[PDB]
Amino acid sequence: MITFADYFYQWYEVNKLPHVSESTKRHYESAYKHIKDHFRHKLLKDIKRTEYQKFLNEYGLTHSYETIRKLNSYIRNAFDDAIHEGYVIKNPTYKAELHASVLEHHHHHH
């Protein structure tokens, strides 16, 4: 059983790679770096939505909205592909909060 980190890279290289460019690679690979950071020996089918949320919060501190948004769609498709193939069963995308806290806009006025 493959981990979420290694699966993400594998899924990418096998599926999205021939359709994308190196400019796209660095997006996926940077995402993969944050993924492998948190989900090291974490199996693809064991991801809880609570920790997935925590992953996004941290990612939204280091990257812009467009970066975290596309990340979400990659992960969503990663589970969508895996579930299609009958490999994964838990999709933690329920709490896929795209909170780019770099630009978390509220009203800080007094």
Q: Which method, experimentally, gave rise to this model?
A: NMR
CA–CA separation, 46 and 87 (whole Å)? 11
* Residues paired with residue 43 on neighbouring β-strands, in sequence order: 3
Locate 37 and state its tokens: 């950071």
Q: How many residues does the chain have?
A: 110
CA dist., res. 45 & res. 83, Å (int): 9
Distance CA 1, CA 14 (A): 17
Q: What is the 3-state secondary structure (H, E, C) of the chain?
A: CCEHHHHHHHHHHHHHHHHCCHHHHHHHHHHHHHHHHHCCCCEHHHCCHHHHHHHHHHHHHHCCHHHHHHHHHHHHHHHHHHHHCCCCCCCHHHHCCCCCHHHCCCCCCC
Domains and CATH numbers, the chain: 1-102 (1.10.150.130)
- The span from the CA of 85 to the CA of 39, in Å, is 21
Q: How many CB atoms lie within 10 A of CB 2?
A: 15
Nearest to 8 by CA among 96, 30, 21: 30
Other Cβ atoms less than 10 A from the Cβ of 97: the count is: 12
SS3 90: coil
